[PDB]
Every structure is written in structure tokens, then in C-alpha cells.
């Protein structure tokens, strides 16, 4: 995608040399914002082949308030294995904060139902937020939230959403981060009888790993392809009743996939 290749280029020309946790060197910039008008197509990178099936499964897993790996494993989605303990537990990461934020007095707040309530009954609210940055629970999480905080906005029959991402690996993680969130904007929109608007991605430490340089140059050689179309085959009775087979990507013709290794 144009916005994405322009950001890859920006990190190459402007990033400062910064190191990652006792390991790999990175080219790094701080503070960046991109906008995707979801009416123009689904923001799935076409300059390299991306597999959406793990993305869908992880999102549906988050929506259930699930913090254990078992569901992902029944579907052979293995992207959280690296962090999970011996019982498949990741600690109170994303879905637990989304669905059951714990208060000092013993309550558990369902931020996802609050947001749908606000979108239906108070759409002009400037407070339609869900946050995963729970300070009191960060020491028990396998990893602190990267996509930490997001806000919905309604204007002119259209749902927009801005994500704050504290930390971003531009090559491996970001195409996945964008498709994940654009999919949720479409599910929320369908549930509230709204049209989709914009996904605004805002990042903090936005970077490229030094051993991914040959791959980023290979990708920047490539011209972007027409963006694909997401079709949802069914309107579920609530946001928590979606199934993997409800989603289809139509018109997706990427360039070949590129492998990105990581140090250990």
C-alpha cells in the first residue's frame, strides 16, 4: 500500500539507529500517523502476501475475553506460542482488558459492550474508547500491549477509529496490525447500522530491524496492487457471535510473500 511504502521509506531515510532489548539494532522514528479510508478497499498489503486466517482467529479470540492459547491451538494458530507458559496462559493481556477490566472494588468492566452502547445511544461522544493499558496488571502480562488504546468516532453515518500503537515493527507486525483493526471497524459498523469510515493508525516507536534491510528494499521495488474487498456473509446477533467463515476477502492479488527472520 502507498501509505505503508511511504512509511517504510521514511524509516529508511529518517530513522535513527536505536537498539532493541539487549539485541538487534533498529532504524527508528517516533510519532507517525496514516489514514485508510475503508470505503476504498480493505487495507491488506499487496506488495507482499499476507495471511489473514491467523488475524481473524486472533481477533475473535480477543472478543471472547480469552487469554489462554487453547482456542488458537484448536485452529492451529500458533502466533502466541512464543509467549505462552506451560498451561497456554498469557496473563491478563488484550481480551481480558477488553472484556473484563478489573476495578479496585471487585467489578470487571466490559469495554467492548460499553463502546457498542455509546455508538448506538450516544454516537457524538468524544469518550468512545477502549484501553488495554492497565498499569496495575502490566507486571503479570506476558508482554505489555503494543496496540494499547483506541477511539471510535461517528460523523455523517460513518464509523472511524484511531489506534495508538506504542511500538511497531514495520516489516513483520504492522500489515497484520492494520488488517486486524480494519476488520473490527467493519464488525462494529455492521452491529451499529453504520457505514465504515477511516482507520487512523498512530504510532510511537516505529521501526525497522537491521537484518530486514534486504527484504524492505525488495518490497519497495514493487508497485501496489488494487486493494481487496471484505465481504461479511452474515450479520450475527451480536459482536461476540462471529465465526471464521463469516469473512471473505475478494479481489486480493499480492506479490509473493517475503520472509523476515528474527534474532533470539
Ligand X SMILES: O=c1ccn([C@H]2C[C@H](O)[C@@H](CO)O2)c(=O)[nH]1
- Known binding-site residues equal 21, 51, 126-127, 166-169, 177, 207-209, 263
Choose among a second copy, ligand X, none what residue 111 binds, the Cβ cut-off being 5 to 8 Å by kind.
a second copy
Residues whose CB is less than 8 angstroms from the CB of residue 19 and which lie 6 or more positions away in sequence, other chains included? 25, 26
| Min dist. Cβ of residue 233 to ligand X (A) | 27
CA–CA separation, 201 vs 75, rounded Å?
A: 29
Among 2, 6, 39, 133, binds a second copy (CB under 8 A): 133
Give the gyration radius of the chain's Cα atoms: 18
Instruction: For residue 167, list its beta bridge partners.
Output: 205
Say whether residue 67 binds a second copy (CB under 8 A).
Answer: no
Residue 256 DSSP symbol: P
Say whether residue 57 binds ligand X (CB under 6 A).
Answer: no
Choose among ligand X, a second copy, none what residue 103 binds, the Cβ cut-off being 5 to 8 Å by kind.
a second copy
Is 146 an active-site residue? yes
Site for ligand X in 128-187 (CB under 6 A): 146-147, 167-169, 173-174, 177
Residues whose CB is less than 8 angstroms from the CB of residue 251 and which lie 6 or more positions away in sequence, other chains included? 41, 226, 227, 228, 229
Choose among a second copy, ligand X, none what residue 174 binds, the Cβ cut-off being 5 to 8 Å by kind.
ligand X
φ, ψ for residue 136, nearest 5 deg: -70, -20
Residue 39 DSSP symbol: G
The residue (of 77 and 168) whose beta carbon lies closer to ligand X is 168
- Return the beta strands (E) in 14-134 as ranges: 16-19, 25-37, 101-102, 108-109, 129-131
Question: What spatial distance separates the first Cα and last Cα of the chain, rounded to whole Å?
Answer: 30
User: Which residue ranges are tagged as binding site for dUMP?
Assistant: 21, 126-127, 166-169, 177, 207-209
Q: Which residues bind ligand X (CB under 6 A)?
A: 146-147, 167-169, 173-174, 177
Which residues are annotated as catalytic? 146
Q: Which residues bind a second copy (CB under 8 A)?
A: 16, 18-21, 28, 30-33, 35, 101-107, 109, 111, 124, 126-127, 129, 131, 133-137, 144, 148-149, 151, 153, 155-156, 160, 162, 164, 166-167, 198, 200, 202, 204-205
Amino acid at each position: 500500500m502507498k501509505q505503508y511504502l511511504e512509511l517504510m521509506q521514511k524509516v529508511l531515510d529518517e530513522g535513527t539507529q536505536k537498539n532493541d532489548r539487549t539485541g538487534t539494532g533498529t532504524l527508528s522514528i517516533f510519532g507517525h500517523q496514516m489514514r485508510f479510508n475503508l470505503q476504498d478497499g480493505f487495507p491488506l498489503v499487496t506488495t507482499k502476501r499476507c495471511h489473514l486466517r491467523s488475524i481473524i482467529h486472533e481477533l475473535l479470540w480477543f472478543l471472547q475475553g480469552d487469554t489462554n492459547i487453547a482456542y488458537l491451538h484448536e485452529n492451529n494458530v500458533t502466533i502466541w506460542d512464543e509467549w505462552a507458559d506451560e498451561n497456554g496462559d498469557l496473563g491478563p493481556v488484550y481480551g481480558k482488558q477488553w472484556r473484563a477490566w478489573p476495578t479496585p472494588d471487585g467489578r470487571h468492566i466490559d469495554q467492548i459492550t460499553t463502546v457498542l452502547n455509546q455508538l448506538k445511544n450516544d454516537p457524538d461522544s468524544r469518550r468512545i474508547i477502549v484501553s488495554a493499558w492497565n498499569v496495575g496488571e502490566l507486571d503479570k502480562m506476558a508482554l505489555a500491549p503494543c496496540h494499547a488504546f483506541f477511539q471510535f468516532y461517528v460523523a455523517d453515518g460513518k464509523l472511524s477509529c484511531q489506534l495508538y500503537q506504542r511500538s511497531c515493527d514495520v516489516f513483520l507486525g504492522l500489515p497484520f496490525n492494520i488488517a486486524s483493526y480494519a476488520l473490527l471497524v467493519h464488525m462494529m459498523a455492521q452491529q451499529c447500522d453504520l457505514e465504515v469510515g477511516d482507520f487512523v493508525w498512530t504510532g510511537g516507536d516505529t521501526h525497522l530491524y537491521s537484518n530486514h534491510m534486504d527484504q524492505t528494499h525488495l518490497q519497495l521495488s514493487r508497485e501496489p496492487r488494487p486493494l481487496p474487498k471484505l465481504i461479511i456473509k452474515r450479520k450475527p446477533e451480536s459482536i461476540f457471535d462471529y465465526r471464521f467463515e463469516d469473512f471473505e476477502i475478494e479481489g486480493y492479488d499480492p506479490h509473493p510473500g517475503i520472509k523476515a527472520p528474527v534474532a533470539i
